[PDB]
């Protein structure tokens, strides 16, 4: 419970309001990869923040590799500004984080068979083609990947607090699977997602 989870990847999307010519967009970006022989879209990485991004002719975009809530909106706004420099209106709309990926380490090894046998209502553990166990948390809804080393991965979340709540909910379970710190201090010590996102310009006129 003392080893607070770290975010590894935040993935988001934004609507542009207007349908646009993706070939025209592909002409001016300083990083771009695109070939209709394999896929009909441009892959578009940037230096700072270190995000990858994607654009669709229908007037929608996706952003990946964000380290913070801030990076997600700030990168999306900078990609939209590049499209506004180009011959399109690109009205920044529908900003959302569809998935969050985080990880933590309890520093003790886990008997995945014991976890799967006792919590089989939520746990799945297939024959060992892959070494890690998977867990389906239903309230709040989170997917957790459990490894024998004590390393843990969390995904399927969209709100920051639920990743820390899911870790805190399974830490007592993991701690029971032991043989021969445990205090969270608070459920969420850091500021909320909204108090982070509000540092970035929200108004679409603030290009």
Partner DNA sequence: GGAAACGGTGCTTTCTGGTAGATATGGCCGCAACCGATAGTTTAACGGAAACGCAGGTGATATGA
Binding site for DNA (CB under 7 A): 8-9, 11, 33, 38-39, 41, 43, 45, 52, 54, 62, 64-65, 101, 103, 128, 131-132, 145, 147-149, 151, 153
Whichever of 107 and 185 has its CB closer to DNA, that residue is 107
Residue 149 CB, shortest distance to DNA, in Å, is: 3
Residue 156 CB, shortest distance to DNA, in Å, is: 12
Cis ω before 124 (30° cut-off from 0)? no
Whichever of 32 and 173 has its CB closer to DNA, that residue is 32
Rounded-to-integer distance, Cα 104 and Cα 182, Å: 14
Residue 36 CB, shortest distance to DNA, in Å, is: 10
Whichever of 78 and 204 has its CB closer to DNA, that residue is 78
Whichever of 8 and 84 has its CB closer to DNA, that residue is 8
Residue 56 CB, shortest distance to DNA, in Å, is: 9
H or E element at residue 164: helix 160-176
CA distances from 42 to 39, 62, 126, 191 (A): 9, 11, 37, 35
Whichever of 22 and 204 has its CB closer to DNA, that residue is 22
- For CA atoms 84, 97, 200, 93, give the dihedral sign: positive
Tokens of 17: 């309001």
Residue 175 CB, shortest distance to DNA, in Å, is: 18
Rounded-to-integer distance, Cα 74 and Cα 71, Å: 5
Nearest to 171 by CA among 139, 146, 138, 143: 146
């Amino acid at each position: 419970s003392g080893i607070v989870p770290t975010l590894q990847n935040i993935v988001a999307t934004v609507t542009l309001g207007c349908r646009l010519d993706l070939k025209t967009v592909a002409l001016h970006a300083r990083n771009a990869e695109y070939n209709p022989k394999r896929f009909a879209a441009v892959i578009m990485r940037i230096r700072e923040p270190k995000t990858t991004a994607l654009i669709f002719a229908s007037g929608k975009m996706v952003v990946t590799g964000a380290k913070s809530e801030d990076d997600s909106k700030l990168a999306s706004r900078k990609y939209a500004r590049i499209i506004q420099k180009i011959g399109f209106a690109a009205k920044f709309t529908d900003f959302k984080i569809q998935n969050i990926v985080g990880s933590c380490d309890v520093k003790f090894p886990i008997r995945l068979e014991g976890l799967a046998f006792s919590h089989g209502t939520f746990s799945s553990y297939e024959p060992e083609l892959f070494p890690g166990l998977i867990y389906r948390m239903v309230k709040p809804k989170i997917v957790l990947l459990i490894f024998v080393s004590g390393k843990i991965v969390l995904t399927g979340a969209k709100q920051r607090e639920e990743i820390y709540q899911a870790f805190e909910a399974i830490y007592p379970v993991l701690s029971e699977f032991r043989k021969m710190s445990g205090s969270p201090r608070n459920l969420h010590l850091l500021p909320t997602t909204d108090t982070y996102l509000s540092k970035v310009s929200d108004d679409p006129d603030n290009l």
